[PDB]
Structure formats: C-alpha cells, structure tokens
Symmetry: C3
Subunit: 283 residues, 3 copies
C-alpha cells in the first residue's frame, strides 16, 4: 500500500517536527530561567572536577624587593643537592620583570618578578628558586608571591599593568619564609561569574623545611630564600552556578513539568466529559 | 457563546486544581522520602558554594596559657612595620576571656581568649596578634587556637561553657609556632546534619614566616608569638544531603515516575482492548 | 462480578509488566550511555562527601634514610610532655620496613618505613613520631612521607614492591622539617577512574611548631624530627563521573525524554486525523 507507507513516513516526519518544537520550547524556557538567574547576586554554586593530562603554564609573580634572584631551574620529582649555596648561576627561566602601582594603596609601587610555572603534572615537574639578601631592615623575612591562571595570557596581554592589578584583586597571595625551603603544591580553582568571566584562584599546601647552612660565619649575615612550586594533582576544581553547571537537570525538570501539564490537560478533558455525562444522567 | 466561554474557563480552573493536586502528591512523596532518609546514618552529601559580600564575624579562641597578649589590631591587606617588638600597646579588639573544663579530659581547665575575627573579605581585612612569654618550661612553644562560626552567637549564648565545649568537639583546632608569624587563611565549611543542626568547621592555609629580631641579647630569652587571621575567599562551602541539597532533582524524578505510571496505565487500557478484540475475532 | 475482578487484576498485572519493561528499557539506555562515556578521556567529575564513624587505618611511609626512629606512640587529642628528648623507648607501632627501586629514577633505591595511622577520628586519635640524626651532610633536613588508603591492603598485598610504586605514583607526598613538630591533619579524597579502579589521594593542613631544646650543647649537633598525624574530619571526599555519581538524574532525564517521545506520538496521531478531516471537509 503506497498510501499507507506515505502516511507512515509523513507521520514520522511530523513526529520529528513536533519533537523539535518541544525541544525549542524547552530551550527557550531554560534560556529564560538562566537569564533571570544571572541577574540575581550570590547564587548557589556547584563543584565539578576535570582531570587534565597537562597543565597550562601558570605565572608565579615574586616580590623580591631588595632580594636578588639567585638561581632558577626546572626539575622532575627530585631536587639535586646544591653545588654552592649563596652563589648565582644555572639560571634559565622565562622571567618577565614588571612593576606597577598597588591597586589597594595607590602610593606604593611593587616590583613583580613573574616566573613561568611547571606544566607537566604527570611527570611531577617543579620549579626551584633561590634568593639572596645581604642587608635587611625588617622584623620578618619573607617574599610575597601570587599565582594567576596562565603565563601566556599575561605575556600577550595588551594592558600588562591592569592584568597584574586584577591578579592582585584575586585571592591567591601567600608568603614563604627565609632560611626555609617551602614546597608549594598549588591547586587550580576556576569559578565562573554570572557576567561570563572565569575568575581563577589557587589553593596551596606548603611544606616548610629547615635549611642547614655550613657556610662560613662571615656570610651568615645574608639570608637565603628557597621555594619550590609544583602542581598537587591534575584535577582542576570548577565552580559554576548550580543551574548552569548541569543544565540537563533543569531540562529534565522542565520536560517533566510540561508533560505533567499535558497530563493535567488530558485529565481535565476526561473529567469535563465525565461530569457532563453525570449531569445529563441526573438531569 | 457564553456557554462555551464558561466551559473553557471552568476547564482552565480544573486544570489549575489538578495541577495543584499533582504538586501536593509529589510534595508528599518527596517529604516521605526525606523523612525516610534522615533516619539512616552516614548519607551521601553534596557540595555547594555560595559567595558572600561580607563575612559574619568569626571567633578566634586563643590559648595563651602563661603567655600575655601584647597587641591586637585590625589591618587591611598590609601589616605596617612594628614600632617596637616585645612592647605592649595599640590593643583594641573585642576580646572575651572565658575558661572551662576540657570536655575530653575533665581534670584540666583551659583558658580561652576569644578575639573577634575579620569580616570584610573583599577589603582583605586581617587581624594581627602578638604574644610574649618570659619564662617557659616546654619542649615546643605554641598556642592552641580554634575557630567557630560566629562571635555574636558566642557573645549572646545563654550557656557559654557548653558552647565552648561544642566548639572543642568541632574539628577546627590548630597551632602556630613561636618566633614565626603565621598567616592563617581560614575558609568556612558548613555541614548540615540530618537532625537539623548546621555544624561548622574551618579549613586553613598557613604561611609560616621567620621573624628576625634585632633586640638586645638580654631580652632574647623571651619568645614572641605572631599570628595573622584572614579570610581566604568569599566563597562558603556548604555540605548537605544529596537529596535534600537539590530537591528539584528528586521532584523531577518523582514527576517522571508518576508520568511513566500514567503512561503505563494508558498502555494497559489500550492493550486490554486490543487483546479483547483479538480474542473476539479469533473466537 | 467475577469477570470484572479478573479483568481488573489482569490489568494490574499488565501494568506491572509494562512498568518493568519501561524500567528495563531505561536501564539499557542508561547502560549504553555509561559505556559510551567511560570510553572518552577526561570527563567532568562531581564531588560527594560521606561521613564515617571510624576511619580505615592508613599507611604512613616514612623515609628516614640515615635517621633512626626514636619513639612511636598513639595518643588522644593531647601530647604528654616528653620524658627525655633524644632518647629511644616507648616504641610500639605496627611498623613494616620495605625498600625498593624508585619508579621515577630506577637507579636509586629508597628505604620506606610504613607506620599504621590513626583510625578513631571521633576520639581525635593521633600518632606521634620522633627521629634522630647525629651526622648529616645535606643543605635541608627533612624526611619524605606519603600516605596511601589502607595499611591492611599493603600488609596483605601479594606484590609489595609494585604497591609501593603505585603509591609513589599517587600525589600524596610531602615533607616535614627538622627541629619542628609538624601536626599533619590528613584528609581522604577518593577518585573513581573510568576503568573501575579507585585512586586515593590525600590533602593535609600542616601546623609547624618550633621545638625548644634545653639539652646540653654537646648533643646540639644531632637534630630531632617530630611529626604528628591526625584525621582532620570524618568526611571523605569522593570524586566520580558526573553521570555515574548520581545515576538518578540520568534516569529522570531518560524517562522524561521517552515520555516526551510518547506525547509527540500522541500529538502526531491526533494531528494526522485533524488534517485528514480538514482535507475531507475542504475536498
Ligand atoms: C518553571 C518550572 C520550574 C522551574 C524551577 C527550576 C528553577 C530552579 O532550580 O530555581 C532554584 C532557585 C533557588 O535559588 P538559589 O538560591 O538556589 O539560586 O530559584 C531561584 O531562586 C531563582 C529561580 C529562577 C526563576 C524561575 C522562573 C521560571
Ligand atoms: C519512588 C520513586 C524513586 C525514588 C528514588 C529516589 C531516592 C534516591 O535518590 O535514593 C538514593 C539513595 C541511595 O542511598 P545513599 O547511600 O546514596 O544515601 O537511596 C537510599 O539508600 C534511600 C532512599 C530512600 C527510600 C525511598 C523510598 C521511596
Ligand atoms: C539520549 C537522551 C539524552 C541523553 C543526554 C544525557 C547525557 C549527558 O548528560 O551527557 C553530557 C555529556 C557532556 O560531556 P562531559 O564533558 O560533560 O562529560 O555528553 C557527552 O559529552 C557524552 C554523552 C554520551 C553520549 C550520549 C549517547 C546517547
Ligand atoms: C637553560 O639555560 C641556557 C643558558 O644558560 C639557555 O640557552 C637554555 O635555553 C635554557 N633552557 C631552558 C629550558 O630554560
Ligand atoms: C621598576 O622599578 C625601577 C626602580 O627599581 C624603576 O626603573 C621603575 O620604577 C620600574 N622600571 C621597570 C624596569 O619597569
Ligand atoms: C588612589 O589612586 C587611584 C588611582 O585611580 C584612585 O582611583 C583612588 O581613589 C586613590 N585612593 C586614594 C585617594 O587614597
Ligand atoms: C651581596 O653580597 C655579595 C657577596 O659576594 C655580593 O657579590 C653582591 O654584589 C651583594 N649584593 C647583592 C644584594 O646581591
Ligand atoms: C581602638 O582603641 C581605642 C582605645 O585605645 C578604643 O577607644 C577604640 O574603640 C578602638 N577601636 C577599635 C575599632 O577597636
Ligand atoms: C580563669 O582562671 C583563673 C586562674 O588563672 C581563675 O580565676 C578561674 O579559673 C578562671 N577565672 C575567670 C576569669 O574566668
Ligand atoms: C569526666 O567528667 C565528666 C563530667 O560530666 C564525666 O561526664 C566523664 O564521665 C568524666 N570522665 C572520667 C571519669 O574520666
Ligand atoms: C615579662 O617581662 C617583662 C619585661 O619588661 C615584664 O615587664 C613583664 O611584667 C613580665 N611578665 C610577663 C609574662 O609579661
Ligand atoms: C605497646 O608496647 C608493648 C611493648 O613495649 C607491646 O607489648 C604492646 O602490644 C604495645 N601496644 C600497642 C597498642 O602498640
Ligand atoms: C634495605 O636496605 C638494606 C641496606 O640498608 C639492604 O639490606 C637492602 O637494600 C634492603 N633490605 C631490606 C631489609 O629490605
Ligand atoms: C629504568 O628502569 C626501568 C625498569 O623497568 C625501565 O622500565 C625504565 O625504562 C628505565 N629508565 C631508564 C633506562 O632510565
Ligand atoms: C647517635 O648518637 C647516639 C648518642 O648516644 C648513639 O647512642 C647512637 O648509636 C648514634 N647513632 C644513631 C644514628 O642513632
């Protein structure tokens, strides 16, 4: 039967058309919900992890001040013994020197030394830094450092000063002591704001290790700073609005609501007929 | 047609009534599920973050023991250089002194100094504390401290002693060393128990910094304790039962199940008619 | 009416049969989705917490090297003052000594001392370790340690060497300094891979505390290492694929999709009749 086959194929096509129409309606309702959500402030946010084979190269903005960088080197899961503490050399890191006004206190300019961070988390790649300071007039010996998402973004940024101020606004600033080697295991946390930008903040697990110096007492006045940066785990924590992070839950809820509405329509159509029949039988 | 319009509006009203009835049934089923869940112990819990513009003022319960508080001051994202280490003055913090019996070991009473914590996370507000100890007979120089949810709750609590014991039961106790300035970046984690109470625990990221003292050798016997408390990020981690944390997923699942049951009812109504017709045709 | 009751009970049985068939179809579709997901690499993973009354005993693999273990003891929420620093005795921990080749650098063999960790988190059980080293030729004084999921698994493992290499592959290695007592608050994080194995990694919150020594200057050459291990909180972080972690969301979405397809089928059946009637009326 050619007519029967034509009717069947047209019915299948109409099934496709109505399924597409329902999908479009659900998508429009979900987009309306998202647009209404993004307006309100402080929404409930969910957590999602995503393992990465290789990390993007981060930026480690040091603040030596009067301290001089002594040595920078990349290593894998082990630190070879130092040839001679307090001596320069063996320095090759992608270091960019920029200094700018502090966004918090506009009166002070801070000198930032940005060093490209490790990126092969699987190989336990780490970066070892050494600093020296002959004379210091301060109660506490420390160097400030903050971590931002990517070194490449800073390198190719059009407004370098503003990018560093935005990084200062981010909550990823710490310190490492003098006379100690601190192993910093940094973790990446990405949060997506409602406006669209993805703010990035870091989490660290320091391991302070005392440094024993056999150098002559003449050079004991100078203090040596050591720090090691390494990725703790390949997993990247992602924070996003609970509705937007997993839209499939909202889609399922909306489909359930629409199907419930249609079932209620069918129930009303049956019930009006039933009550009309009852009224006709009674009177 | 007045009758047609009346029938249509009555049908819409009946749609509303049946939709409300379905919502009530789904709500009752969800409440039954929640009541059954809350009985079982150790449920699977989810994680939700919620950014806050301003933090509630926390309580930092120090345990100086023989140590004397030297100076307390609130600062913003920077610590001014100390005028004179080891000297009192410039002390203004909301400090409440209470001491009580240890819930773990009832034989020992512990002296707790509670200091109101920072609350403007956006401005990077921080609290700086100094302690002094002339003579000490101990292998390790440290001061215990634990953090609870709100200082105001402790201040207006009816049973002060019991509140501190409950805080001791909470897992938010740490230490900071002597001769070092430790920057404590505390994070708030709220977990909601099945009974209804919301237990609060803290997460910290210390940054130990060595302290260099130029004071005369006569006063070197006394040891100085420094600590800084600051909120790491405005986000507050919230932990709740997976079913209760996002009830919309359970509501969607229940609506889907009810609609599937109704579809099965329709399928049975069609299939019984089909098989009756088949049986009548055959015999 | 016996016939009416028989028809009703048969209709109920057919309802059960069709509900079971729908459940089987949804289960097959969900299993297909899971099998397709598990093939792709780097999926989005969710976070679930689960409180435990008691922890499984972990394994703390120390790396003293030339250092000699001085004392091991289990305590509850308090460390009694040391009877005499630098002296052995009071040693009773379940310690297993194994040494093997480093998976990263095959040329070096590492000596591992595994100590059973605390398990009563509710009682704040902790393990205190002491180490001694007379002569050392190294710039930094530290002992490596890594934490794996269970001590019992290592104890009864058939291939001990391979298990330790797998633990080394896990990202749970840290250090503790010399001359300081570091309080390690370890947290358990379980991640389930797509292949099926559950990798385990740890998170720690160290609390470095300076150690004051009154021992005679003759013995000051030797350095003493102190470390304390304790569970931070009973909650265990579990990381799993977002689809697999909460299958109920996927089941609800699939049921909604199938019900939407059936509703589209009904709409097509009505619309074809409506358009056929319209065409017949027109021509
Ligand atoms: C419409 C069917 C049911 C959808 C409910 C599904 C929407 C949904 O899941 O909202 C939870 C959320 C709770 O707020 P929250 O503090 O968690 O963010 O609600 C709102 O506050 C704004 C809703 C946006 C306004 C919704 C406008 C429709
Ligand atoms: C009823 C339709 C389907 C609902 C399923 C939706 C209910 C649901 O999501 O439960 C998952 C949970 C898994 O336990 P879990 O260890 O994850 O907690 O189940 C239970 O153990 C208790 C269920 C409470 C008992 C449920 C009583 C109905
Ligand atoms: C079929 C009805 C709708 C199901 C959608 C529900 C399936 C679902 O939730 O997928 C989200 C996920 C997003 O990928 P993701 O990066 O988050 O992992 O999709 C895929 O990439 C693979 C899907 C597996 C392939 C799905 C094959 C059906
Ligand atoms: C290492 O340093 C040398 C200069 O001493 C430089 O030419 C080389 O590119 C550096 N390699 C890396 C990977 O930094
Ligand atoms: C950085 O500081 C120096 C002075 O130390 C001065 O040249 C100017 O403020 C900045 N210059 C550079 C190199 O950006
Ligand atoms: C500091 O300088 C900046 C420059 O933009 C300005 O916006 C800010 O108001 C100033 N704050 C003061 C006056 O302390
Ligand atoms: C510090 O002292 C060393 C000693 O050799 C000297 O070479 C160097 O120029 C001095 N300046 C700094 C701060 O590096
Ligand atoms: C600061 O200290 C003075 C007393 O020296 C006190 O009157 C004032 O209220 C304090 N301010 C704050 C904010 O603590
Ligand atoms: C706190 O301790 C003191 C003794 O140091 C004693 O008065 C009593 O135990 C407590 N008193 C206060 C001030 O609560
Ligand atoms: C310690 O004293 C408390 C007071 O309530 C009591 O409950 C507990 O059993 C005591 N523990 C002992 C006797 O060690
Ligand atoms: C500690 O020593 C200082 C030295 O001036 C003295 O003023 C003070 O009374 C002593 N007592 C304490 C523990 O503060
Ligand atoms: C404590 O040490 C003794 C030997 O000195 C041993 O017999 C006993 O089993 C140990 N107890 C524990 C719990 O380790
Ligand atoms: C561990 O090391 C020792 C040498 O210190 C040697 O016997 C062998 O390499 C290993 N032996 C044991 C006890 O496993
Ligand atoms: C180190 O030895 C192991 C033994 O299995 C081997 O697999 C690996 O390739 C070696 N790496 C080298 C040659 O550096
Ligand atoms: C270290 O010195 C102590 C001093 O009594 C001695 O007993 C011991 O045998 C020496 N060896 C080690 C490394 O323990």
């Amino acid at each position: 039967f050619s007519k029967a086959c034509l009717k069947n194929v047209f019915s299948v096509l109409l099934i496709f058309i109505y399924l597409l129409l329902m999908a479009v309606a659900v998508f429009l309702v979900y987009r309306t919900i998202t647009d209404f959500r993004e307006k309100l402030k402080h929404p409930v946010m969910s957590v999602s992890y995503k393992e990465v084979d290789r990390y993007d190269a981060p930026g480690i903005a040091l603040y030596p001040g009067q301290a001089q960088l002594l040595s920078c080197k990349h290593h894998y899961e082990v630190i070879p013994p130092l040839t001679s503490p307090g001596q320069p050399g063996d320095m090759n890191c992608t270091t960019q020197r920029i200094n700018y006004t502090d966004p918090f206190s506009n009166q002070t300019v801070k000198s930032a030394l940005i060093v490209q961070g490790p990126r092969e988390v699987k190989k336990r790649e780490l970066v070892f830094l050494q600093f020296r300071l002959n004379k210091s007039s301060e109660d506490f010996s420390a160097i400030d450092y903050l971590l931002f998402s990517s070194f490449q973004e800073f390198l190719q940024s059009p407004n370098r000063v503003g990018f560093m101020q935005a990084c200062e606004s981010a909550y990823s600033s710490w310190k490492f002591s003098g006379g100690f080697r601190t192993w910093v295991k940094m973790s990446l946390v990405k949060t997506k704001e409602e406006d669209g930008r993805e703010a990035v903040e870091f989490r660290q697990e320091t391991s302070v290790v005392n440094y024993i110096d056999q150098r002559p007492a003449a050079k004991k006045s100078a203090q040596l700073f050591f720090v090691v940066f390494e990725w703790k785990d390949p997993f990247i924590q992602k924070v996003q609005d609970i509705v937007t992070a997993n839209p499939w839950n909202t889609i399922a809820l909306l489909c359930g609501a629409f199907l419930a509405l249609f079932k209620a329509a069918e129930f009303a159509k049956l019930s009006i007929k039933w009550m009309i029949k009852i009224r006709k039988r009674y009177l």
